[PDB]
Every structure is written in structure tokens, then in C-alpha cells.
Symmetry: D2
Subunit: 474 residues, 4 copies
């Protein structure tokens, strides 16, 4: 199979050791990626630090052009990359091409968003008369070397969301894709190589996150860690980061609160699309329904039928439900199913597993006593929790240690907004499924779902500090 | 003994154990402060979390009103507080009173700055045509419970700079002052008590940071940690915070770069004032002069003469140089002085120590081979390092692990601005000593000097998060 | 009792004066000066002379002066209110409220203004070759600002211009309305006691029909901040030449009522918005556009609430007091007669006692009636029934006025979509229209005005920018 | 030969036409329609009809159209520049530069405008009782914008208005200068090929002397964005009424030279800023205010550098080219004559051949000479010797113009101090004046303009705000 290579200091490098990658759906070998040594990781960081000063010396418009070029290249090769991305993560071919497309759209937007960066002028006379002739010219500077780490489910899209914002501001990148998804990650790297950015400005790292994961995060050459993945790992990175700045996008368990005055048809469709997209292997997705009892039977009946219409199959055919990322992930999901079942939950759709392809399951009658009501499944299993008041839904919703997003289905806006203030999440969508949707929009999670505010504009702000030059006027 | 109490959930409290505080300049007992146990800490936090919701439900102008009363009380009692502060940390009485005035000003400014909290409306149609009718209404929200920790040299000033910005935003506070300075800390607490903020909104914690320090920081009730202290403790706080947000203000070794075309008389005064203020026990302060050989002889001669003009005595006499904070510090400072003398640097003043009162001393011909070239003394000792190029001055300056602020004395502004870009620090002052000065201005430190951007406005932004509510217009 | 203008630190009288009478009783209140052109010239010359030293002060210093003035107004709110109440026949308690509102706006403008910020723009954003070139952009004052207030809020709509103007470093020439000049000068007193530098703040009294055009045409004035009728507003638009202006003009705010509305909540908001100060409010519900199906219910509710309104003298705090003058009363009565005479259904008796007009509600008002379009400025409310939301938007936009609008309904997304279509500045959902919350932007479309007000915007409007560009080496 | 106007997606000629000739050669370039008032009415009627649907489009959709227009311009920069150069006798290479610059501004405005954001304000910021009330403020287009460019930059100063306008959701009615209308129609071609909806972008041609007032006074126009003489500008101010406007008028930029100035750097900048396009530029050094102790040395450097300036035809990219028309050169000659009679010294040959005047350097110019204040728009540079910085500022501010200023010194703190005092929009330290980098603000003080330009400010200027207020429950 093809031995992929990391892009280091303008050169493609193999490592003495490698990691073989297999297709989650077919099981066929896709290729191998390098299993870097600490020494090699040192070389990557040393290269990026050396290239930083000259990268920062360039003009904003110059750096923007480089990023636009990468986007253009990605668009040109969107089908070649999608073909392999689809295979590497058992993701539908079309959505795979979609991820590549969104990645280009984000890179472009971040490029133009970051070149308009401005500074401020503050008046000393605002705080004290004696200082009225003193002013502060405050401009933005990069934080230095940014370590970007993406997730298996969006190894490219959630790579660009970090890389472009970091680069437009004059930062340099060390990109570490998920092992399962590193080929797609290195394919993204090829685009940066061809755009011709100076050597060391963009570099990749590959190896098992469990073998060099800590080493790359603890390394003192790194000035900022931008991460997406499980909460468990996020916590660890939080500590290893020390006092250095970070950005974390972690686990989710988005609740969809359904009131009595909700358009039940619109709620059912939105929940279906949000809950079962990518077989529930999505971070920001409806993972629990908190519906007022008087409307529960009707809502559940609607959701049941819609689940039956979902297509089940191979990513090749763009099936709604494809095989899960791996065996363990599927075993884990079966565990949640067993627990809900043993404790009384009602499965309204067939419980079936063929390999790692689990059929879409609708669990009604789920209670706060079942694991499924709290733990993030990352499988096609949607639990329905019947409540008796808005107050109860909020309690249950906030009880979760997760707070990425929430949906409120109601026709009483003012109340919706009031409820929104109470929910401990980053974003609340009214009468719509949750979604990172519209990358210029802020994206964040409360509690253990993250740290920092994402969304293009915010990402750029997050990976820059300020340099204040003060002087008195004569 | 005069036993001071902590302010907890609207009440004053003592603990089974206490800590006696003495005057660093005389040994006289000032009183004692409680040495809280973990249970008492747990209660402070439980009381704060309970009061946070009702505090956040208030209007901005209401919270602003409460803060303005505190400020008025502080001004009214500036002579009272100043008197005790002066004795607790052996700081000049007049500067002590000035600290209180500075605290009130900051509280007033944070009240008005924060009540004008604004949000933003983003257009979905900015990213994709299909979401043109989708908008995002983003409003600021508090993070929750903020743990504020001040240093011994500005126990009140560096308390207000955290408390007020935090409170106006809807966060609740737990204020931990430094032990040597805890009486002044509880005096400040009095103002919040008399102002009548709801019980639990503001609370204090006293005890040895080496006995409960880690406990209060590690407690999972704390949502944010705002700290000013040594780099050592800061690094420690960065780790215990996990993935929780923090603000750190640490060690400094601000350099004063002096170019050949500088106004030597103006440069000497700024240097004398900046380096010897509060006997060098300041964080933002000229602690090393990097001066071009060409003008070094003349510059040094001016500084030498101004040093001998500095008054030395007790805090009640408003002396320039007063006894250091404690024996360990005087010992340490004496150690740095001796290492420079023994290594051959040129002492331009007599070496003299009486008790913990170290006479101001100037060293010329200091080399990078000397400890005094890098270590933060926190004593009246100023090293002069001669250089032969701006290039070298910049290298020596960036070589330090500290990067709080810096001073550039020159008449070539364009170049001064150019040099500023290269200096790894937060703020660069042209023709003026370094200073946090004008609290509306950003205040941050690079490398190991800190994390986060202070300055009233920035403090508020840092201690708030965002809540996005998205819906479609019909 | 003769009142004097405040000019260049001195209180000055003119030979010619103008007596002011209580609109409710007719009792003489006092007299205000009737300035000559030369006198006006001195006010302006004093201001221009003082502007440099005024601008040279720190922002915080200027804010302290304003905070002073405000504190003084709060202290004398009853004293000033008692006279304002009588000068424009406004409820005593609400007159005091105007004073407080004025103090609040002054304080708020003080703190909003000292936080004035600048920008640092990067040349490298536009072209590589200019990457070392930066622009430090700071805000500066325009110069001399001429503020003119209306009779209905002679003080409130004075401070809303003066404070924003001053904090930014401009100097003020304040022209209160003739009927309301005593309250204006009373305000002037607060500024005098505050001790602002001589010439920084000045007042001008005199009939707008005798000197109005002169004060505006004077080439010393750099900015005109006006509140009044559209007719005058439009004139100022022309006399201003190319100079910057801010105009707050006429309004005929509509209250669109949909079928899913809370009729009880809608009625109360409409009563409050329509009859406040006897309808002598610019931003106020002046026409209801309601879906037929719920028209009958809504109208019955509004009818009863109208009858519960108090009618009387300003000292008794009546809801409905005598209109500002006889000419206005005649106009309002003409609008009432035209509606009745054309077949509109009057749900309240028609009665005028002197210049006191009783609140009246007209139902079945057609676009054929004058009341459907002209700003009455009296206690008369027309109800126009429509059969669709589309028709309500058409009827609303058809007006030449577009200050604010109200939409009563439970369908928010639809309300937002309607707001976009409405040609107005602000749309309130399930609430009467209001300038309310002075930090909020306040503006009108079409013939309702020019420029965006509200503390923040007022300040931005009365300052320009100074860009200093240089290259870093 | 016969060019057509682009109206509502169609190219149309008018009953009458206007012939355009090459300023430098006199040859006929072609003709442009001479619209009748009725044809103007159709342009406005068409644009107002297509505005709603143009506004209904997403920001990114509108930005895409602008990008395409920009791309077409880059593709035809030579083709267009060749004709532009001849229409206004501008160097061929700099003519192509205008087109490029125009494309750059269009792309920048597209991306700047699509990122447009709104704001949410808290009622609880002003009063505790309105803490549940919030205002969702979003930006809306003003509607129909009339864009009018000058002869010297018919394409550049057209696109600087059109792009910021369109991205915001407004519709455009573009009126170029007669001498430059062909270029303008060439620009229109790019918009037609980009395929923007019909009526969104339209052009108007006709002598600004017959329809000039008609197009401005028309009530369909919501905003007028103009660049031209102070005279026509003052007039548009009045004809605008109370409608919003943007004016970029005349300038008499001063270059203040201090004793510590880098005289060689100073001189080079002055030569470049003063004689660019034969002085037919608005933002340009038009008067040197130099300290006496260094004048002789600076004047000598300037005198020599002037002699190195090329003089000839536009096709040869000559530094100095014929002036726009006969009257202009007559006017310049009038200035040179008054300067001579009054005593000034001409250090370079005074010569006129046709409408091509050789670069003239006048030294010993006093404030009594017309040349010291009047905008020449000819290759004539007056040097005014002062004996104190205080005087330089006085003389500089004495002018009725205040577009930009240059300060050549090395004492920055002081330069900044001088800058605050200079009554201009922008101050360049040690660099000739310039609209320099389009994201930077561009504005003029006093009679040099109205409104703040610069891409970002342009967009904000041609947009209003819509506030929807509701209470959270
Ligand atoms: N909120 C959001 O925006 C967001 C976005 C994406 C994902 N998520 C969450 O991410 C999870 C699914 O992603 P995943 O399975 O890929 O998560 P994961 O197992 O946490 O890994 C995420 C990334 O972390 C790397 N990693 C592992 N151990 C590390 C260590 N010690 N130090 C540094 N990096 C280390 C991984 O490398 P290897 O692949 O080599 O192990 C991978 O690139 C879900 O819980 C989902 O909700 C949330
Ligand atoms: N950049 C800035 O703005 C800034 C401002 C102020 C000070 N500083 C730096 O601070 C130093 C002087 O202050 P200092 O000597 O008082 O600092 P310090 O010893 O680090 O202590 C500062 C505060 O931290 C508390 N603390 C100690 N151990 C702790 C622990 N394990 N967990 C949580 N809190 C703990 C202390 O309590 P106890 O008093 O009970 O030990 C005290 O309140 C200098 O290095 C100076 O440069 C910098
Ligand atoms: N500050 C700046 O950015 C800037 C930029 C460019 C020019 N300028 C100034 O403009 C002047 C040179 O330009 P110019 O000679 O073309 O200016 P102009 O004579 O004032 O005319 C400018 C534009 O106005 C049109 N126009 C004429 N009469 C009009 C009327 N009654 N109503 C509406 N529009 C009318 C002209 O049409 P016709 O061609 O049909 O006459 C032309 O398109 C100088 O004073 C220069 O400083 C300033």
C-alpha cells in the first residue's frame, strides 16, 4: 500500500516506523502513515519556530493569497480527497466531498476575515487628566507556533478551521490529524505544499495520539494548542498546557426541548436530521429529546416513521446510516442499548447489528436512571425523555456535564429566549436542530464541552495577543 | 489580640485557628486573620454559587450602583485603609493612600465600562446564501464563580482590578488576599459589606497559600481564577486549573533600552523612578538597563547621583526606600548584590543592609554571566548592562523568560516602533518608565510574565462568555 | 419675573422680551429675552473662542462637569418640574420625570463619551507595499453645535443633544422653543452652577420666526441638532448647506395588530402610547391597523380604557391636559370634525373646553379621512381595519412618516419579517412605540428625520475623525 | 463611435448625443447619450423596482457579482485604459493603473461588506426596569444611491462609491463626468457582463449643466455620493434637502517643512505629490509652508527635480500633460499672472503651448497672492516661507480647504501635536498626502467634503439601521 509522508520544513518525510490504516467499512488497507519519533517532532517544531519571524514579516494580504490558493487547490481536488476521506472514516462519499468543500470555504473566509484585522488607540485622558496627552497604539500580533489537532469525524474540515485562522494572523502550524484520518489529513497537507507557503510555516505530525500525544502538547516550543476531540483527552491537554492558551471543542449531548405549542412535524424532521446524521457520530447533534408529556405520543410516532425511511448501508451509496468508526465504538453503543433496555426503555425500531453497522434505534420511555440519557453514544440511538414542565426539562438539560448546544421547539419566542438564558450551552437554536452551522457564527460549549470561542472571527482573535506602544504627544 | 474576620455569605467569621500579622518595618503586631479550614472554604463557595443566579438576574445598572457605593466608601476611608496598609506591607503612607484611591477609580471605571455590555447580531447570509434568513443574536454572560487572588505589594489595588470587572458582569466573587496583606484585604471587604451587596456575591478567604492555596484553586466550584503573584505559583495555578479559564500576572524584569540619541536627563529620572519605586518591590518596573556604550558613561553618572538623593526610612516618613517585605526577601536580594560584587561588576553605591532595610544600590558593567542580569530581585538593586547595538539590546532583552513591559529611550519614533515589534513583551513605553498606568490601557505579559489581557475593558471580556440564540426570520 | 440668557459666563437680558403664559390657566409665567442678530453673533463668537481650551481638556474633566450639572438637576427636579409643568401644561409628576430623565441622559452621555476610542489600520491589509504604513485614527469634535429643542420636551430633548456634544469637545449654542424657554433657561442655570468654562455652553431665546433662520444660517455653526416639525426640519435641511445635521421630526407611528395578538396587552399599550401627554408625543401610537376578525374585541377594550383616563389640569396630574395652544386645539378639532363628518364611528363624545380636548377614539377610519394621515398632536386615535398583513404594511408605508411601529402578535419570526418591510427606524413587538432606553438607537425614516440618535450614536454623529499616517522602520 | 447608457439591463441611446474629444489631440473619441428628464425617470423607476429583490439576496450572492465585475475589469484593463487615457489626457500607464485600483476597491468592498454585523443592546444598561428589553439592531440599505464621479478619476472614483453601495443592498444610478463618460460607460460594460439583475446598476449621461440639478433633486434618490468641485458640492448640499450625502470636494493640501526635516526626502515627496497628473489631483501638495532657515536648500532641490520632469503627450506617459480643457489653462494662467505681478519668483520657465503648461515653481509666495489659496489644478507649486511652526499652522488653517496635510519633521511627538491642530482629515508624517490605502479613512474638513470615505466608512455611510425591540419572558 502507499506509504504516506509528513510534510516537514518543505519536505516529505517517512519515519523509521509506520501505522497501517484500514477502511472501517470494507476493512481493506488504505495505506500507512509515519509513526514519528520525539526527535522528529522536535525537528518539526524547530523548523516552524525558525520560519515564524519571516512569515509574520509578510503583509496580511500576502498571507491571505497563500490561503486562497490552498482553497482553490482543495476545490480542484475535492473529489480525489473525498474519495479517500469517505473510505478512511466510513463517511458518505458526497458528504466527504462536502467536508472538503466547507474546508475551502472556511479557509477563504478566514483569509479575508483576518486581513481586515485592526488595532485600537486608547486615550489616557479617559482615565486621568494628568495623562491626557498619553495614548496607546494597540495592534495585534500572533501567539507564535500553534498546535492543531483534529478529530476522526471531521479530520479535514476541523483542521482548516484551526489552520487558516492561525496562519492569517502570522502564526505557524504543526498539524496533527487523528490516526484514523491521517491519510485524509496528509492529503490536506499536499494542498499547502502546492500553494507554496515558505518551509516551516505549515507542518504535519503523525503517530499514535497515545504514544506522542503528551510529548507534542507538553513541548515548550508550542505557544497554543487548538483541539477538537473527546472531553477525556481535552482535560489532559488542559493540564499539560500549563499556563499556555488553548482552545477545546469537546463532547456533546445536545438536548432538544419540545414544548406543547411546538410544530410537531417540523420538530420531528429537525430531530431526525440532527440525531442520525453520520450515524450519530457528530459532536453538535440532538442526542436527547425532552418533550412535554401531552405531546409525546404524537411526536414519538412521527419520529418513528421517519426513522424507518432512513437508508442503511455503505458510504459508497451515501446511506444515511453507515458502519461506525470501529468495533469498540459499536460495542460501547450496544452497552448503552442493553442498559436502557434492561431498565425499561422502549425500543420503537428494530435493534440490529451487522458488523459495525448498527441500525437506527429510537428509544422511548428513557429515564434519568439510564446511561443512555447522559453518556454520549456516537451511534444511531436517540432517547426520548418525557417531562411534565419546562422547569423539569431545564433541570435535566443542565444536569448534564455537557453544554455544546440545545434546540427549543416552541411558538412562544419570548419564552424561548428566557429558557435560552437558563440553558448551560454555547448556542441555542429556536425551532431548528443544533448545528455548528454558519462558520462566521460563534461556536462554543459550556461546562465540559469546551474552552474558548470558535467560529472564524473568534478563532483568529483567540490565536493572537496584543502589543501596546504607549507614548506622550507634544 | 485584634482578631479580624472573613466576610462570608453576608456575615463576619473567625476560625478556630488564626494567623498573626506583624509590621515588616517594626515587628509590631497588627492583629490576626483567620486560617480557614477546607470546610469553611467549601461553605464560602457553596454560598457564592447559591447567590450567583439572583445576582445575574439583576440589571447592569443595579450591579453598577453597588460597585459605585463601594468606590465611594473606599474614597471616604482612604486615610483609614491607607494607614493600616502602610504598616502591613511597609509601603509609604502616602502611596498607601494612593493605592486605595487607585482601587476606587478602577472600581468606578469597571462599573461604567461593564454596564455598557454589548452583543452582536450576525448574518447567516454572510457565509451561505441558503442561510440568509438565519441570524444569530449573541449576548455576553458571566462564567460564574471567580476566585480572585492578590499579591502582597498591591493587596487592595490588585484585588479591585479583579473583583469589580468580575461583579459588574454578573459573576460572584471569592477573594483571597496574600497573608502578609490579609488585614488590608479584609478592610476592603468591609466596603463591600457596608455597600450591601446581596449575601454570597462577595466573600473572602484567608489562610496560608501553602496550606490551603492548592485547595481553593482545585475546588471544582471555581469557574475562573484571576491571580497576581510569582511565576512559580502561576505555573502551578495553570496546571490545577485544568481546562478552566485563568488570568495570570507574574514576574517581570522590564528592560530599559537606551539609544545613542536619547535625552539622557529624562531617561535617568524615569529609570530612577521606575526601578526604585517601593524599593524595587514592583512587577512592572525597570529592572535592567540596556544602554549603548557611547552614552553609558554619561547616563550611569546621572543615575548614580539620583540614587544618592533617594530617601531611606520608615513607611510613616514616606521614604523612597523602606524595609523589604520580609527577611527571606532581604536575604535573597542581598544574595544577588553579593554575587554581582564578587563577580566584578562595578558598584556605584555602598553595599549596606540593616535589618531588612537594604540601601539602594547601582551596578555598572553587569554581564549576562551575573545572576542580577536575569533574576527578579524585588529589592532596590539596579544593574546596568552595556551593549554595542540595538540588535544586541533586543537579544539580551528577549533572552529573558520575563516579558511584562519595556522602555525605549530614543528620538527616532519610526525605529522605536520597529524595535517594539521585536520586543517580546506586552507593552512598550517610548521615553517613559514602564507602568501598568492608565488602567483602561491593556495590561498583559508575554512568555512567563502572564496569561490573559488585563486592563478594565479586557478584564471584563475575559471573565464573561457568550450565549448565542439562532433562529430563522419568516 | 424676567429670565436672562446665559452668554459667555454672564446672564444677559435684551431690551425686547417675550412674555410666556400658562397654556392651562393663561396666567403669566414670566418673560424671556428676544435676542437680536448682533446678540446672537456674540453668543457664537464666545463659543468659537472657548472651543479650543474646552477641547484641550481631558475627557474625564469634561465628564466631571456634566456629572455636576446632572446632580444639580436631580437636586432641583421639583423646582424645575413645577415650572415646566406650568409652561407647557404637562402633568406635574411627569414634568419632574423629564428632569430626572435629562439628568440620567447627561450622566450616561458623560460616561459613554469619555470611553471614546480610536482605530489603528494596517496598510498591509490593502497592499503588500504599504505593510509598514499604519493609520492611527482618533476622534475629534466638529466645533460649534446648535441644539434646538421642541416644546413637548424642552429640557429632555435639550440634554439629549448638549451632553453628547460637550463630552466630545464641542461647544453648545442652545435654543429652546419659545413656549418652553423658561424651562430651557432653568436648565441653563444648572450648567452655570456646574461652572463649565465661559462660552462652552450658551443659550439663545427668541421667536424662531424672527431669528430661527438666522441662527441656523450663521456660518459659525458647524452642526445643527434639531427636534421639531417636519416643515421646519426640512427648512433646516436646506439652510444647513453641506454642514452636518441631526433631525428628529414628525411621526404617525402605526400599531399593527394581528389575529393571534394578546388583545388585552395590545389595548393597554395602545392607550398608553396614544394618549400620553394628550397625544402630544412624536413617538406614539397614532393609528391602529387591525385585522378585522379581532377588531371588534380590541376596540371595545380600548373604548373602556379611554373612558378611564383622567381629564384636568397639570397640577392634578391628569392624563389629559390642555393642548399647548389654541391654534393646535383648533387643528385637532378640525381633524375630529372631518372624521365624524365623513362617517367614522366615534366611540367617545366630542368635547372641547377652552383648549382642553377630551380623549376620543374613532373606529372604521378610512384612508379617505385626514385623521388617517396627518399628525394630530392631540388626544385623538383612529382605528383602521384591514383584511391582511400585506394591507397593513402598505397602509403603514404609504405614510410619509416612519419614526417607529408596533406589531402585536405571538409569531415572532413573522414579526421580524414584517419589521424589515416597515419603513421606520424602530419596531416594537407587543409593546407601544417609544424612544425608550436612551442607549438604544433612535431614528426615523423618510420625513421623520435624519441621522441616528441614542447616546452612543449622538456622540458618534457629533464628532469627526483625524487620521495620522506614518511608516514604521 | 456612439456609446449607449445601461438602463434596466438594456443599452439605450438618446434622441440627442454629446461628442467627446481628446483633450491633448482634439480628435473625436465618440459620443454619449444626452438623456432627457424622462429617460432619467425611467432609470430611477427601474432601479427602485429592482431594489427589493436585490436586497432580498444574500450578502455573499451580491459580493459574488462584485467579484466578477472586478475580474472583468482586470481582464480588460488595457482595453479600457487606452480609451481612458485619451478621454482625459492621462498617462496611459497610470490610466491602466486606475482600472486596476478600481478592481481592487470593488473586491475589497465586496469582502468588507459581506461581513456586515449588527448589535444587541441591553435595556438594563440604562434602567433597571427595562432589563428584560433588548434591541436587535441590524443594518439596512438606504435604497437608491446616485453616484457621480469627477473627470480626473471617472472609473476609480466611481467604483469607490458603486461597490460599497451595492454590497450593502442599495441600487445604483451612476452619473460620470461628460469628459469621462465614455470611460464610465466602459466600466458599465463590466457590470452588464457580470450579469447583475436588471435595474440594480444603471448609468446616466447628459450635461451636468442641463440635467445636473434634475438628477439630484429627484425624490427617487435616497443618497447622493459625489466627488467634484466645492461649488457644485455646496449646491448638492442644498438640493439634497435632509437626505444623506457624501461629498469629496476641493483641496489645497499643505506640506509643512520643519528645520529638522530630511530635506532630500521632503523634496522628492513634494515633487511627486504636487505635479502628479499635472496638478490635476485633489489630494496633493499644493503649497509648501517651509521654515526660512531651510527654504533656500529645499527650494533648490525642488527646482532641480522639477527640471527632470518629462513634458509631453499621454501616450508617452509624460509626467506633465495637457490640462483637461482651455478654460482650465486660462484659469491657471490667471493665477501665474497675479503671482508674478505681486512679486513671486518663478524658478522654472513659465510657458504655455495650447493647454499644456510647463511645471512652474514659484518661490517667495505671500499670503496676498491668489496662488497661495486658490486650487489651481495646474502644474504650479507655490513655496510659502514662514518663520515659526505656529505661523505655518495658522496659514494652513486659514484656507477654507482641509483635505490632507504633510508634516516633514523627525520630532514625532511634536508632529502628532501639530497634526491635532491641522484642520484636515488626514495628516501624513514625512510623506506626501494621498488617499493612501483605501481601507484607511478618507475625509475632508471644512469645505473639502462631507462624510467619511475609505471602503469601510463608505459602506457604513450608505446604510441605515433597523431596530427590533422586544421583552424576554
Ligand atoms: N465540540 C466540537 O466541536 C467537537 C469537534 C470534534 C469532535 N468532538 C468530540 O470528539 C469525539 C470524537 O473524536 P475522536 O474520537 O477523534 O476524539 P479523541 O479520541 O479525543 O481524539 C481527538 C484527537 O486527539 C488526539 N489525541 C489522543 N490522545 C492524545 C493525547 N494524549 N495528546 C494529544 N492529542 C491526543 C487524537 O489522536 P489519535 O487519532 O492519533 O488517537 C485525535 O487527533 C467526540 O466525543 C466528539 O463529541 C467535539
Ligand atoms: N504582572 C503583574 O501584574 C504582577 C502583579 C503583582 C505581583 N506580580 C509578581 O508577584 C510577585 C510578588 O508577589 P508575591 O511574592 O506575594 O507572590 P506569591 O508569593 O506568588 O503569592 C501571590 C498570592 O498567591 C497566593 N498563593 C501562594 N501559594 C498559592 C497556591 N499554592 N495556590 C493559590 N494561591 C497561592 C499567596 O498567598 P500567601 O500570601 O498566603 O502565600 C498570595 O495571595 C513578584 O514576582 C511580582 O513580579 C506581578
Ligand atoms: N476630495 C476628493 O476625493 C476629490 C475627488 C475628485 C475630484 N475632487 C475635486 O473635483 C474638482 C475637479 O473635478 P471636476 O472638475 O469634474 O468637478 P465638477 O465640475 O464639480 O463636477 C464633478 C461631477 O459633477 C457633475 N455635475 C456638474 N454640475 C452638476 C450639477 N448641477 N448637479 C449634479 N452633478 C453635477 C459633473 O458633470 P459634467 O461632467 O456633466 O460637468 C461631474 O460628473 C476639483 O475641485 C477637485 O479637487 C475631489
Amino acid at each position: 500500500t502507499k506509504q504516506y509522508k509528513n510534510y516537514v520544513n518543505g519536505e516529505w518525510k517517512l519515519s523509521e516506523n509506520e501505522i497501517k490504516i484500514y477502511e472501517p467499512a470494507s476493512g481493506a488497507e488504505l495505506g500507512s502513515v509515519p509513526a514519528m519519533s520525539t526527535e522528529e517532532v522536535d525537528y518539526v517544531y524547530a523548523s516552524a519556530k525558525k520560519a515564524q519571524p519571516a512569515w509574520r514579516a509578510l503583509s496580511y494580504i500576502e498571507r491571505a493569497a497563500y490561503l486562497h490558493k490552498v482553497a482553490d487547490i482543495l476545490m480542484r481536488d475535492k473529489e480525489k480527497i473525498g474519495a479517500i476521506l469517505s473510505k478512511e472514516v466510513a463517511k458518505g462519499y458526497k458528504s466527504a466531498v462536502s467536508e472538503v468543500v466547507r474546508t475551502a470555504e472556511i479557509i477563504n473566509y478566514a483569509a479575508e476575515e483576518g486581513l481586515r484585522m485592526e488595532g485600537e488607540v486608547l486615550e489616557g485622558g479617559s482615565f486621568e487628566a494628568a495623562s491626557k496627552k498619553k495614548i496607546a497604539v494597540v495592534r495585534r500580533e500572533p501567539v507564535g507556533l500553534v498546535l492543531a489537532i483534529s478529530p476522526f469525524n471531521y479530520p479535514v474540515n476541523l483542521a482548516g478551521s484551526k489552520i487558516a485562522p492561525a496562519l492569517i494572523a502570522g502564526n505557524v502550524i504543526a498539524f496533527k490529524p487523528p490516526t484514523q484520518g491521517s491519510i485524509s489529513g496528509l492529503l490536506l497537507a499536499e494542498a499547502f505544499a502546492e500553494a507554496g507557503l515558505p518551509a516551516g510555516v505549515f507542518n504535519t505530525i503523525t503517530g499514535r495520539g497515545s504514544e506522542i500525544g503528551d510529548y507534542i502538547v507538553e513541548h515548550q516550543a508550542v505557544n497554543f494548542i487548538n483541539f477538537s476531540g473527546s472531553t477525556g483527552i481535552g482535560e489532559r491537554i488542559g493540564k499539560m498546557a500549563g499556563m499556555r492558551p488553548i482552545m477545546l471543542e469537546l463532547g456533546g449531548k445536545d438536548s432538544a426541548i419540545v414544548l406543547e405549542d411546538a410544530d410537531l412535524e417540523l420538530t420531528a424532521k429537525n430531530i431526525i436530521a440532527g440525531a442520525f446524521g453520520y450515524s450519530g457520530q457528530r459532536c453538535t447533534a440532538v442526542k436527547r429529546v425532552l418533550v412535554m408529556e401531552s405531546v409525546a405520543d404524537e411526536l414519538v410516532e412521527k419520529i418513528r416513521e421517519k426513522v424507518l425511511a432512513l437508508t442503511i448501508g455503505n458510504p459508497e451509496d451515501d446511506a444515511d446510516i453507515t458502519p461506525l468508526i470501529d468495533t469498540k465504538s459499536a460495542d460501547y453503543v450496544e452497552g448503552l442499548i442493553n442498559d436502557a433496555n434492561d431498565k425499561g426503555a422502549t425500543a420503537l425500531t428494530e435493534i440490529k447489528r451487522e458488523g459495525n453497522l448498527i441500525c437506527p434505534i429510537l428509544f422511548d420511555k428513557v429515564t434519568t436512571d439510564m446511561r443512555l440519557a447522559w453518556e454520549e453514544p456516537f451511534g444511531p440511538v436517540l432517547p426520548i425523555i418525557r417531562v411534565t414542565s419546562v422547569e423539569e426539562a431545564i433541570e435535566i438539560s443542565n444536569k448534564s456535564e455537557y453544554g455544546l448546544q440545545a434546540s427549543i421547539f416552541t411558538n412562544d419566542f419570548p419564552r424561548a429566549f428566557g429558557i435560552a438564558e437558563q440553558l448551560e450551552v454555547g448556542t441555542v437554536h429556536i425551532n431548528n436542530k443544533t448545528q455548528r452551522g454558519t462558520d462566521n457564527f460563534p461556536f462554543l460549549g459550556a461546562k465540559k464541552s469546551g474552552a474558548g470561542i470558535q467560529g472564524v472571527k473568534y478563532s483568529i482573535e483567540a490565536m493572537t495577543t496584543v502589543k501596546s506602544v504607549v507614548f506622550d504627544i507634544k
